[PDB]
Amino acid sequence: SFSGYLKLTDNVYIKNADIVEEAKKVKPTVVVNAANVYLKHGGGVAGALNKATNNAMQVESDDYIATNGPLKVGGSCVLSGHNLAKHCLHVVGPNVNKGEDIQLLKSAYENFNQHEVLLAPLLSAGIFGADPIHSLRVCVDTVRTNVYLAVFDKNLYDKLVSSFL
C-alpha cells in the first residue's frame, strides 16, 4: 500500500513524490489526473501520466471526448488507469492562467468524495496557476475520503507541510 506519507488530517496524507512513480509502485484503485476540459494531456501531471501509459490514456480520452464532448471546469470523468491504476479520475480544476473561476476548486475536489481512496496531485497547482497552499486547504476542507497527495516539487512539499494549519 501507500508508504512514506505524512498524515495531515484524519483522511489527508502527503508525500514528496512523482505521482507517476507512486502510481507504478502502488497501483492504486484510483489515480487522479489534473485534466483540462478537453482531456488533452500535454503537460504537468496530465502529460506525465499520459506518457507513462505510452499515449493509451490520450487515445482513450479522445474517444471519450468524441462521444461525450468536453468536461465542465470543476467536473470529472472516470476512465481506465491503464498501467498506473485500476481507474483514472480525470478532474478539471480551474486554470487561473486561463482566467477560470478559482471558486470552482472546491467543486473540483468534491469529485474525490465519490472514491474511498485516491492517489492525487494538488488540483489547480503547478501549470494551472493557483496557489498550492490554497489548493491544499481546499482539499483538506472538502475531501472526506482518503486522499494520498503526491507533490512532485521538494521545496513546495516543505513549504506546504511547514505552513499547514
Ligand X SMILES: Cc1n[nH]c(N)c1C#N
Among residues 109, 112, 152, 157, the one that binds ligand X under rule CB under 6 A: 152
The three grid cell numbers given for residue 151, joined into one nine-digit string: 507533490
Query: Which residue, 112 or 152, is less far from ligand X as judged by CB?
Result: 152
Q: For ligand X, which is the closer residue by CB, 69 or 154?
A: 154
Residue nearer to ligand X on the CB measure, 14 or 68: 14
The least CB distance from residue 121 to ligand X, in Å, is 4
Verify binding: residue 94, ligand X, rule CB under 6 A.
no
The CB density around residue 117, as the number of other CB atoms within 10 Å, is 15
Residue 148 Cβ vs ligand X, minimum distance, rounded to whole Å? 11
55's CB contacts (< 8 A; 6+ apart) are none
Q: Identify the residue among 5, 11, 18, 38 touching ligand X (CB under 6 A).
A: 18
**Under rule CB under 6 A, how many of the chain's residues touch ligand X?**
10
Are 25 and 19 within 8 A, CB to CB? no
User: Distances from the Cα of 35 to the Cαs of 29, 42, 64, 149, 159, in angstroms?
Assistant: 18, 10, 13, 16, 24
